[PDB]
From a paper:
Next, additional structures were determined, all in the presence of SPM, and using N- or C-terminally linked GFP protein. We exploited conditions in the presence again of BeF3− (yielding a structure at 3.7 Å resolution overall, denoted E2P*), or without a similar compound (3.5 Å, E2.PiSPM). Structural analyses to SERCA and ATP11C-CDC50A suggest the SPM-structures are indeed caught in separate E2P and E2.Pi configurations, with the E2.PiSPM structure indicating the presence of cargo is sufficient to stabilize an E2.Pi state. While the E2.Pi structures are highly similar, distinctions are identified between the two recovered E2P states (see further below). However, while we do not detect polyamine indications in the E2Pinhib structure, poor cryo-EM density for SPM, somewhat shifted toward the luminal side compared to the E2.Pi structures are available for E2P*. Based on these observations, we speculate that the affinity for SPM increases from the E2Pinhib to the E2P* and E2.Pi states. The E2P structures exhibit another peculiar feature. Sandwiched in-between the soluble domains, a long continuous density is observed. While poorly resolved in the E2P* data, we assign the stretch to residues D74-G97 of the Ypk9 N-terminus based on visible side chains in the E2Pinhib cryo-EM density. As observed in our E2P* structure, these shifts weaken the interactions between the N-terminal loop and the ATPase core, leading to dissociation of the auto-inhibitory stretch from the soluble A-, P-, and N-domains. Polyamine binding and the coupled dephosphorylation lead to the release of the auto-inhibitory loop, and the formation of a binding pocket between TM 2, 4, and 6 (E2P*).
Author numbering: 204 to 291, 317 to 550, 554 to 582, 588 to 720, 746 to 787, 791 to 798, 826 to 1011, 1023 to 1030, ...
Amino acid sequence: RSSQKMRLDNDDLTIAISGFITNRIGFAIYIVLCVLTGGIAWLFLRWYPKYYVKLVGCATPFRDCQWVVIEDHFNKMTILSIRVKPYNLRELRSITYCYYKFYYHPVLDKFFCCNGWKDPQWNSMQNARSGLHGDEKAHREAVFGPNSIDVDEQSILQLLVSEILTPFYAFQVFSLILWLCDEYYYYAAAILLISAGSIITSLLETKETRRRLREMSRFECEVRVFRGGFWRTFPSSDLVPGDVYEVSDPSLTQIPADSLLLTGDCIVNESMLTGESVAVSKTPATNETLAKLNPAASTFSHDVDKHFLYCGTKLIRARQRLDEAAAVALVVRTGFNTTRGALVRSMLVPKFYEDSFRYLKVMGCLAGLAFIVSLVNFIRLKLHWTLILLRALDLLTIVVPPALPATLTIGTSFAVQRLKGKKIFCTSPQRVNVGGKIDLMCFDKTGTLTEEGLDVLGIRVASRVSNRFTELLTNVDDLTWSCDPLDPYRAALYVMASCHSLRIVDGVAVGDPLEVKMFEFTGWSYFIAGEVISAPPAVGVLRAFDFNPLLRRSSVIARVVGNSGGYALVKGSPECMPEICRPETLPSDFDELLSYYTHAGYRVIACATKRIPKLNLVSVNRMTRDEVESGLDFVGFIIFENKLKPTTTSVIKELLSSNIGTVMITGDNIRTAVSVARQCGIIEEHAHCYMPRFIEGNADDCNAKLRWESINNPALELDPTDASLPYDNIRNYAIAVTGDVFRWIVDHAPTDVLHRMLVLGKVYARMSPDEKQELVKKFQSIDYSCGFCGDGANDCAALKAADVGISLSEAEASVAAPFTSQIFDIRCVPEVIREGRASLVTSFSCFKYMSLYSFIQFTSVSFLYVSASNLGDFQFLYIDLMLILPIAVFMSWAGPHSKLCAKRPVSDLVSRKVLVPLLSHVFVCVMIQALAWVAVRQQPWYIPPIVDTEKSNIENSENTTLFFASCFEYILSGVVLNAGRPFRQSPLETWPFLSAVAVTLIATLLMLLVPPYWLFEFMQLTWMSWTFKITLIAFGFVYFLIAWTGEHYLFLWLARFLGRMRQRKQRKLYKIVKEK
Ligand code: BEF
Ligand SMILES: [Mg+2]
């Protein structure tokens, strides 16, 4: 065999592998053998390697191969090499591509994806609790390896060539060489140092930020592993499949590796990997799950899910110790194979400046014509042969300025610093300019909009005087004073505060996460719990009949200090309670209130009490459970909820103000996602909802029909044959799609169902990571640009597909986003949007200015190549150093405004609104230069330029006039082409830029009006007339006025005028279509 095609199911790649030996016996044209090119051939074949491979390697079978080459379906090429190890076949020939680790098979002569995955013959029969008896940490750790070591930025060269190395290098290097050959001492060095400093600074900054963020993601833990029948502590990075450890140990807080409980139980919280906001319980494996276990499965059935622990899931509680341990666990998948890991690896597999590429190619095309005409004129004047190339090739390096990327990078860093000054850290500087075109902002529910746990909302009390519920009573302070365990209020306070199996450790209890929050809601101090000292008596606890799967309630026998008798306090599930309680106490509104509080997403809990007169140390053990819950008295409801973060609503309001659509994408259920949306503002307060349900046939059938119904009032609907419009509070509505209906729609849709759904859909629930990324792709296909404020691994993949990615937890693997935040809130988005818009407008301003610079320079030179006399060699330097770089750099020294606006900056460079003002600025600048030149042509003397010689003489009156006019144009155009009040702070407010402009203009005025004689010789000036010296000032002033008035009024009007003359986004059509 000599080739192979894989099939990668986790991410569709279908890679192609082919093996090649190293150089031939004769390799005289190898990359370094082409030393005549040196680095040129290296550059040529670094990106496109087909010639590289055809030059070097020939086909060899995989048995004797020396390096393999990998080809995915993007037609993107890569080259890897095999490794070698001499023990268990006699050699593990293998390769590694994007963290997939492919093993050779000496028997069938093909590659395999880790031989699939292992199900050991010794493991999983009945009892794999023996442990790794002997040497099974060396003979088996070689195959599997350590736990999730990512990369150390393989070499600096890839980072340099990807993040920083712009395509402008070739012409820039040629320009530096030409200037070196043309006696440019100062400016070549200035350009080289500025570019090198900026690039090295960027590379070092990004490397250090990446290191700082990656070091925190290690999360290394310690575990008490069985080895050979002994108990030994070990680091978390020393585990292989078939190795037992223990869970009940207090020092453990996160599951090390994906596992399978064998003895005991536990309660865990899988929030981040799935999205559910409810803690889950686990149970052992009964020798039937072990046989029905294939670790290769992408997602398990319900049983094996019920017995697994997922790596990274937070451990809440375990069966406590009796010196021993009661929660052992087996290890099945370690490394990248873990479910949390597989998202990280599959994230990295898939690999505006093109406008600058267009400008570069157009400028090169124009430089061709300029070169042609310059050579024609030079050969017409038959000047010295050497001087028919150098000064006839400076045209190219002055029509394609090389100082552009440096100033763009500096302007970007002036915003990256402001971002890092607000606790927001950026790991990819390019995305800042993408922040100014966000037209949709997607969120997540658990962890970003709302806190990650359940919080008690209030207490409802079933009075005994009138069988009617009472108000919400959100605070215990009002609870204590309320009156009518004979009093139901106290019988509710006791059950909230006492009656729980909590084990306090450090003044804050640890245990089941439901009654804990209840305990802190009570606020008392904790086998007796005395009330807060700031009148409630002291409660005593005797014995607890705790939770049972069959009977959903728990009970406690308590004794008040003051009273002689005792009480039985029970807390349970309202579904089963009424058959226990005394029927003449239920307030007849039980069903309605329960249904109301359940159909909104909340969760409820019922309390009941029973007085018992005779209680002693004997009857406590004598009486069984049934007598405790024989007949009791209902008290009321304890209502949970999913609390919002305190500041989310204001941020959502401000985003809705500035005409930015918002949607919510979650993984929880829909019944609470709708209510969470309705509280904050994503859905309007009175807007209806509409859900699509299969009228007949599940997602299996391709012919199934879908009915779009309401939620609050069934039997009502909007159109299905498809209009997504109200059939037959009606102008506003929103569609909330489940997680399987969306899959069926994307599988089958008339392309109008999908589009109207995507325009109207607001609250998606039960969505999976692949569903999330397909949704983001469809969102971008209808011509959006959607940011994503995700926080967990469950939505890591989407964070890569979005245009702008934010994150809320740098600790976990959500570092995929180009951004990262250290203040966990939604208060992070408006700042990013503001900075993005300001950076966009500043980048366009600087780009237009630096592209007008070239035309100024070219016109000034071309008025002079008629007589073959350049500007000089020091006026060039003054213009290119003291005039451009200060103005161009300091024009980006500002910050964004404080408040958002409904407006939006332009985003397309080649549009008919960024280019027309530029060309008209050119057509006023050339007008004023040629005007001054004509003004000096006739009225003043000395106007003859010296006839052509071997050395192009440069002391004329056609040099000095077109040097001052050019200088004034540089300064004033730099002032005018600015970004002011609409998206930045007022220029008058910030001093650096305006003071730089003032000092430079004073310098020029001093050099013109009364020039020092030593400087009058240092440059090649010539004497002028007082009147003409005033005239130059007048020309500068009128350029200022004309440029300002045109830039604010004229050229935008002419833009629309020419657009209308030329008259002779897939969405924003559907909105009008469905306006009703
Ligand atoms: F925690 Be979220 F659902 F990504
Ligand atoms: Mg999550």
